Amino acid sequence: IKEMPQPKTFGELKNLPLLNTDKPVQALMKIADELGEIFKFEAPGWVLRYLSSQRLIKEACDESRFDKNLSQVLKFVRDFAGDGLFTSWTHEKNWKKAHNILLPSFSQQAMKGYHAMMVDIAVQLVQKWERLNADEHIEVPEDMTRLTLDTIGLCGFNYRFNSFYRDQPHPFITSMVRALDEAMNKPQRANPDDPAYDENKRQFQEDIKVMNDLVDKIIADRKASGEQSDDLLTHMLNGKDPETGEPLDDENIRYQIITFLIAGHETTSGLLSFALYFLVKNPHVLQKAAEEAARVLVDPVPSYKQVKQLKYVGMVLNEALRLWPTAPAFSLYAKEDTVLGGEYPLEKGDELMVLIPQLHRDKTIWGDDVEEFRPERFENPSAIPQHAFKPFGNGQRACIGQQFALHEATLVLGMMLKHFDFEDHTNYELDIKETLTLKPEGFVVKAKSKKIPL
Numbered sequence: 499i500k501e502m503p504q505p506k507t508f509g510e511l512k513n514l515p516l517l518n519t520d521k522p523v524q525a526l527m528k529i530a531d532e533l534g535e536i537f538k539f540e541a542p543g544w545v546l547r548y549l550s551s552q553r554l555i556k557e558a559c560d561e562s563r564f565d566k567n568l569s570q571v572l573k574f575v576r577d578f579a580g581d582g583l584f585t586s587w588t589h590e591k592n593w594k595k596a597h598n599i600l601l602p603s604f605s606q607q608a609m610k611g612y613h614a615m616m617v618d619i620a621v622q623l624v625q626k627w628e629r630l631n632a633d634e635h636i637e638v639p640e641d642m643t644r645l646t647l648d649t650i651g652l653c654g655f656n657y658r659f660n661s662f663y664r665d666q667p668h669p670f671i672t673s674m675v676r677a678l679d680e681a682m683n684k685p686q687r688a689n690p691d692d693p694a695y696d697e698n699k700r701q702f703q704e705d706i707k708v709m710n711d712l713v714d715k716i717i718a719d720r721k722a723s724g725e726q727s728d729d730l731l732t733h734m735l736n737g738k739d740p741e742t743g744e745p746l747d748d749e750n751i752r753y754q755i756i757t758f759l760i761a762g763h764e765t766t767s768g769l770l771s772f773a774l775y776f777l778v779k780n781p782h783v784l785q786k787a788a789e790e791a792a793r794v795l796v797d798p799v800p801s802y803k804q805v806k807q808l809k810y811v812g813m814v815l816n817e818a819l820r821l822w823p824t825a826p827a828f829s830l831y832a833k834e835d836t837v838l839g840g841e842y843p844l845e846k847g848d849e850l851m852v853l854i855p856q857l858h859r860d861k862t863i864w865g866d867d868v869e870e871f872r873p874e875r876f877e878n879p880s881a882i883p884q885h886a887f888k889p890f891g892n893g894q895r896a897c898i899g900q901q902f903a904l905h906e907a908t909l910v911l912g913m914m915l916k917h918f919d920f921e922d923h924t925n926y927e928l929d930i931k932e933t934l935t936l937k938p939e940g941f942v943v944k945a946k947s948k949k950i951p952l
């Protein structure tokens with residue numbers, strides 16, 4: 499039985515001021531680097547144990563001992579995402595109900611049906627870049643976010659955000675981004691009732707209204723039409739949970755749509771942005787991926803089968819998730835009193851946070867060269883130990899969108915590599931901005947068209 503390390507304290511605020519930063523996950527990674535595989539983090543309101551080693555994270559991933567927890571941030575995201583799949587407790591009826599209804603809509607087999615509207619958006623990205631003038635550059639995370647938001651809008655509810663027609667975000671997105679920012683900031687506040695936060699609280703209620711009104715109208719408009727589209731909203735209006743026999747009600751459908759739009763905006767766009775960052779920084783890898791794209795994508799429009807054939811592009815995406823898993827943490831709670839790693843006693847209800855970027859740098863698993871971008875780590879995927887690579891979370895509370903995100907990312911990265919050469923014209927210095935997710939802020943490239951028609 500060992501005493502766990504604890505970072506520096508600030509008197510009665512304990513560790514909480516360590517999160518008073520725009521880059522809290524990067525701060526926690528440096529604390530993990532100093533303290534090791536586990537540390538305690540105390541705040542006036544709560545305690546977290548942060549895990550970084552495969553040894554301890556493999557135990558935390560045992561669903562008989564530990565279940566998904568909502569962190570303080572997810573409890574505040576729940577003020578707009580409600581009991582949607584991401585912000586529900588496993589024991590809430592609406593979690594298993596929505597899980598059983600939506601799993602078949604997110605299968606690899608379902609991707610065949612979404613492929614054509616993913617291509618619609620991907621072609622809009624390629625056409626944008628083909629139409630840039632010689633002196634111009636690409637704002638990478640900006641354009642990837644236009645793409646990924648628009649893809650989930652169209653595949654999810656046949657709604658076109660038309661992000662490539664805009665500089666200023668859609669008003670729905672203005673409100674969602676500002677609501678996410680308020681949720682992430684509320685926990686680092688020592689006096690949340692201070693009157694200096696009154697305008698923040700008023701703005702938060704307004705943003706929740708903007709989101710509820712567009713989404714509630716989208717649902718009500720589809721119910722009125724009877725239109726049977728190939729989309730998640732049709733699936734949710736018609737579906738019945740095989741276990742309870744119940745359909746989702748309209749409130750819970752709104753929370754799922756809000757949840758999917760948060761995911762589409764925040765996650766896949768980060769993955770694509772980090773993948774392009776690693777490619778321009780590692781030109782031999784770029785050339786392997788470009789060669790595969792040229793060999794495989796032989797038609798003007800990629801097919802579903804051709805995307806599945808892009809093995810090396812998939813290895814690039816997995817190695818970007820290893821170094822910078824764009825959703826970088828998930829929380830668990832102890833179901834009962836238990837001892838972690840034969841050393842750290844936990845009480846029923848004790849909260850854990852998995853630092854996925856630190857798990858993915860465990861030298862006992864990956865070797866000493868963990869900071870190197872090497873897609874070949876994923877060439878023979880059964881070689882990775884159980885619970886060593888967790889960019890989509892764990893068990894029954896793993897990402898439902900994993901096959902959607904990887905199909906879209908593989909399609910788009912394959913098309914980008916088929917159509918363009920890329921230049922890191924600024925020798926860009928990685929700067930990682932943190933929202934719900936990680937993205938490379940200020941990342942710009944120049945593209946040179948290969949002049950290959952669509």
Ligand code: HEM
Binds near residue numbers: 597765894898904
């Ligand atoms: C590369 C892209 C993505 C990454 C890295 C990612 C990562 C994750 C992770 C780490 C979790 C677990 C959260 C936790 O345990 O608290 C999760 C859950 C979830 N993700 Fe994703 N995500 C991605 C894309 C998406 C997309 C595109 C969608 C939907 C369109 C989505 C929908 C969800 C939902 C609904 C859950 C909750 C699942 C459940 O608990 O039932 N994700 N994701």
Ligand SMILES: CCCCCCCCCC(=O)N[C@H]1CCOC1=O
Binds near residue numbers: 523685826934
């Ligand atoms: C799916 C990715 C979710 C992003 C979460 C990453 C945030 C890291 C900062 C953190 O540990 N904050 C804790 C402290 C108390 O309450 C929280 O929530």
